[PDB]
Write a protein that binds this ligand. Structure first.
Ligand SMILES: *[C@@H]1O[C@H](CO)[C@@H](O[C@@H]2O[C@H](CO)[C@@H](O[C@@H]3O[C@H](CO[C@H]4O[C@H](CO)[C@@H](O)[C@H](O[C@H]5O[C@H](CO)[C@@H](O)[C@H](O)[C@@H]5O[C@H]5O[C@H](CO)[C@@H](O)[C@H](O)[C@@H]5O)[C@@H]4O)[C@@H](O)[C@H](O[C@H]4O[C@H](CO)[C@@H](O)[C@H](O)[C@@H]4O[C@H]4O[C@H](CO)[C@@H](O)[C@H](O)[C@@H]4O)[C@@H]3O)[C@H](O)[C@H]2NC(C)=O)[C@H](O)[C@H]1NC(C)=O
Ligand SMILES: Cn1c(C#N)cnc1COc1cc(Cl)c(C#N)cc1C(C)(C)C
Ligand SMILES: [Ca+2]
Ligand SMILES: [Ca+2]
Ligand SMILES: [Cl-]
Ligand code: NA
Ligand code: NA
Ligand SMILES: [Zn+2]
Length: 802
């Protein structure tokens, strides 16, 4: 760096200059490459940040941090309180809220600017609890559009979340999978301290600033050097906004290190937290007074957003791997509010992950972490498909830490931390949108930060890069510039087989003990098999298969299914259980009954003999025999086309769901509609496997083994209407349960299922959209609701927090 070129005329230049020409953009500080006079010219502080009566009308003096002279507004560099102090205008916070129906912008603005105001560690409940000391923020919140909270991504750390906001991507796709990382392809490490984090190969996807630039829209800086004071960041944004039309950016970011920085020292609600909240609110007032001075306060869209919350954690709530493993120096742990384990050295072939897992599993009765192979983590976390994520993972209980040994923690500092499971209440953060493009005085439901990239693109007239948002699911935040998606086109149309095979054509090894014989009830069973009850059981139309495959629709009195001829089982099975329905047992004449389905050939069917031979694998049913409507209909549940492969350990789970919980939910929700099926994700990418990806079959057959079993449980949001006769919006909960040959995940599993199955199921709660990615199906195709509303429903996650 030839650091005696000047920064005069160039302070906070938007375009970078190449070495050895010295840099005046921020970042120069983080690369130790600013011109000599950067601090003198670009970080002025003389006289501070506010006009006072004496300074009014002063003679411009270029030394001052900001100006109170007559020319300041045309120059764009007044102190933010200049009109208040010198011109008897009011602060923005003191003005009544007035609806912003249309952008009210100076001439030459082609679109409303967007300012992203990101606040580190701003936990959701600060909006209520800190309301009395945050008047600027409360005005934004109550006059704009807000959610009660915003769900971050896992892990609930800073870079992963801010880079998710910027990209629309899950950490596993963008690459920033933690605040610290090892990449084995690069054989390189990423850390908070230092300079390797600045290398571009860490940062995948396409962040907003590049999407903007590629499409002709200019962007301010996103990263601010920590030494640049907040008042200077604000003033710099206001200055940029005064630029001429061909130079002026349309998108800006402000970042605050608070309240996170104090939160770590004092805890989320320590009495010392009041002042950091006051100071953030002041900064917001500065921006808004600044915008008002420039006539931009009814022209800009402002997004007030956090990265994550903050929880109470102290040194004494640390679990030590040294209390579990005697081999502790054979491993490297990424420690803290999550754990990631790999081998200390890759030439130590002694190392065995399964013995590590086994040594970490349910060893102390209150153990405050749980070990997982990463493919076995809750699919809702989307935290597996990246080489930077170690195969072994520890999910840590809220309020706790994990470390390798006690010398790591005592060689106490802190009272707050974050990083936990992203459904945890303390990790939730905030969203407020304010401006012409946002709605007025509107509350919207909680949503995930992965959704914002699409909105930010909508706000700016950009086409979003491919991302994990569901574009349109946040249209209800927006006054206009909505994105109007169409439903994906069905790729494969189903077959509707009739009766084509005789009983004796099947050699299955299946006994069913069922021979016992009317003409009233013959046309009656015929019409059920042709789809007469189908409107009762298929409430929202059939799911659409979005890939090329061969399948059949099979109708029955109590349930309807799309049966895959390639996978030899259903892709989905749909049934409705009313509030009035009764549970019955499986009779004795039918316990090991499996019956041929005479609509589907022997060659596209499963067989019992494969199950008998497979000593690890048994079978269950997608439509549960327990809930059949009549003894005649119960025969249908024993069709071989309703059977699926299940480990006996998983059958404990599945039986309890089918026998107890479904009926419970129908009572609580006034009927439910259920869609259940299998999921195959052997490469843990969150997407449906092709047949050639499947790693496990039922011994000696072509029957593929699911990695997971899903269910989607839909009812009427107004629960006074029964599920099958609902006029308005819907209510959904779903899960994606791991199909595991043991219940090691559930420490209490030796007890009766009412003590542990429901807990397992809540941990594996899912969005409908997660199931779609995993199955290639598109649900809710025929409802009376608008498509955007259905998109919102598909992104809903039932979290089971209070
Ligand atoms: C969330 O949303 C995202 C974004 O939409 C979804 O991720 C996409 O998933 C797609 C489907 O899996 C995937 O498409 C593949 O792309 C390959 C080309 O990828 C490069 O170019 C793109 C475009 O600029 C870029 O986005 C990619 O960036 C990744 O890679 C770099 C470094 O590796 C990272 O810095 C970056 O973070 C990102 O990493 C992530 O993605 C990769 C996978 O691409 C993961 O491995 C990482 O862990 C991380 O998650 C790339 O720079 C392309 O090569 C693929 O094509 C194969 O597939 C078919 C097979 O029939 C064939 O037509 C092709 O020829 C090719 O097959 C051949 O190669 C095979 C593999 O080498 C080989 O086995 C065969 O034998 C064949 O010869 C494929 O099209 C797309 O890249 C990602 N995009 C991103 C940003 O992640 C994600 O799925 C969503 N999640 C959910 C749950 O919905
Ligand atoms: C985290 N941090 C530090 C530190 N330490 C200094 N400045 C920042 C803000 O960066 C951001 C701010 C926003 Cl608002 C968005 C978004 N969207 C994205 C970023 C990244 C991180 C550049 C990706
Ligand atoms: Ca943070
Ligand atoms: Ca897959
Ligand atoms: Cl981390
Ligand atoms: Na068996
Ligand atoms: Na167990
Ligand atoms: Zn922090």
């Amino acid at each position: 760096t030839a650091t005696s070129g000047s920064c005069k005329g160039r302070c906070f230049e938007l375009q970078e200059v190449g070495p050895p020409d010295c840099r005046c953009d921020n970042l120069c500080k983080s690369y130790s490459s600013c011109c000599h006079d950067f601090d003198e010219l670009c970080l002025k502080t003389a006289r501070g940040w506010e006009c006072t009566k004496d300074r009014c009308g002063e003679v411009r003096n270029e030394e001052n941090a900001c100006h109170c002279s007559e020319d300041c507004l045309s120059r764009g560099d007044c102190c933010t309180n200049y009109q208040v102090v010198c011109k008897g205008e009011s602060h923005w916070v003191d003005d009544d809220c007035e609806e912003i129906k249309v952008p009210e912008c100076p001439a030459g603005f082609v679109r409303p600017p967007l300012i992203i105001f990101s606040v580190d560690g701003f936990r959701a409940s600060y909006m209520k609890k800190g309301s009395k000391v945050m008047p600027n923020i409360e005005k934004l919140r109550s006059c704009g559009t807000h959610a009660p909270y915003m769900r971050p991504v896992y892990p609930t750390k800073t870079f992963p979340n801010l880079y998710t906001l910027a990209t629309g991507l899950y950490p596993e796709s963008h690459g920033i999978v933690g605040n610290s990382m090892y990449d084995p392809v690069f054989d390189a490490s990423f850390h908070l301290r230092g300079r390797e984090k600045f290398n571009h190969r860490w940062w995948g996807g396409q962040p907003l600033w590049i999407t903007a630039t590629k499409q002709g829209v200019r962007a301010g800086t996103f990263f601010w050097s920590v030494s640049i004071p907040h008042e200077r960041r604000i003033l710099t944004i206001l200055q940029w906004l005064s630029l001429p039309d061909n130079e002026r950016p349309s998108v800006y970011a402000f970042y605050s290190e608070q309240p996170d920085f104090s939160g770590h020292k004092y805890g989320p609600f320590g009495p010392e937290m009041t002042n950091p909240l006051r100071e953030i609110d002041k900064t917001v007032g500065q921006l808004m007074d600044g915008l008002k001075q420039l006539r931009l306060h009814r022209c800009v869209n402002v997004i007030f957003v956090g990265d994550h919350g903050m929880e109470d954690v102290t040194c004494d709530r640390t679990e030590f791997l040294s209390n579990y493993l005697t081999n502790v120096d054979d491993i490297t742990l990424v420690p803290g509010t999550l754990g990631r384990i790999r081998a200390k050295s890759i030439n130590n072939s002694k190392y065995d992950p399964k013995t590590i897992i086994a040594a970490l599993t349910c060893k102390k009765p209150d153990q405050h972490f749980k070990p997982y192979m990463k493919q076995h983590l809750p699919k809702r976390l989307h935290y597996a498909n990246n080489r930077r994520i170690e195969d072994i993972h520890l999910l840590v209980d809220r309020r706790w830490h994990v470390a390798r040994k006690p010398l790591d923690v005592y060689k106490c500092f802190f009272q707050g931390d974050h990083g936990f499971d992203n459904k945890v209440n303390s990790m939730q953060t905030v969203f407020v949108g304010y401006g012409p493009t946002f709605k007025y005085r509107t509350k919207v439901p909680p949503f995930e930060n992965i959704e914002l990239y699409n909105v930010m693109c909508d706000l700016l007239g950009l086409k979003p890069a491919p991302n994990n948002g569901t574009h349109g699911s946040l249209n209800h935040l927006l006054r206009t510039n909505t994105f109007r998606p169409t439903m994906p086109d069905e790729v494969s149309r189903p077959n509707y087989p009739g009766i084509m095979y005789l009983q004796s054509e099947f050699d299955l090894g299946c006994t069913c003990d069922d021979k016992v014989e009317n003409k009233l009830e013959e046309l009656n069973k015929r019409l059920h098999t042709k789809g007469s009850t189908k409107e009762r059981h298929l409430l929202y139309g059939r799911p659409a298969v979005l890939y090329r495959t061969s399948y059949d629709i099979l109708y029955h009195t109590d349930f309807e299914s799309g049966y895959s001829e390639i996978f030899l089982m259903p892709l989905w099975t749909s049934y409705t259980i009313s509030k009035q329905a009764e549970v019955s047992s499986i009779p004795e004449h039918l316990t090991n009954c499996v019956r041929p389905d005479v609509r589907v050939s022997p060659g596209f069917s499963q067989n019992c003999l494969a199950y008998k031979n497979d000593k690890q694998m048994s079978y269950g049913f997608l439509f549960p025999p327990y809930l059949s409507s009549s003894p005649e209909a119960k025969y249908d549940a024993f069709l071989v086309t309703n059977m699926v492969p299940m480990y006996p350990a998983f059958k404990r789970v599945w039986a309890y769901f089918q026998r107890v919980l479904v009926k419970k939910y129908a009572s609580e929700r006034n009927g439910v509609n259920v869609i259940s099926g299998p999921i195959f994700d052997y490469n843990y990418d969150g997407l449906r496997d092709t047949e050639d990806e499947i790693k496990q079959y039922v011994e000696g057959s072509s029957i593929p083994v699911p990695t997971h079993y899903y269910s989607i449980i839909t009812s009427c949001l107004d629960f006074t209407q029964p599920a099958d006769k609902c006029d308005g919006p819907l209510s959904v909960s779903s899960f994606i349960l791991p199909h595991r040959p043991d219940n090691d995940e559930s420490c209490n599993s030796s007890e009766d299922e009412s003590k542990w199955v429901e807990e397992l199921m809540k941990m594996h709660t899912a969005r409908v959209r997660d199931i779609e990615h995993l199955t290639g199906l598109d649900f809710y195709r025929k409802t009376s609701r608008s498509y955007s509303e259905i998109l919102t429903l598909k992104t809903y996650l039932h979290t089971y927090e209070s």
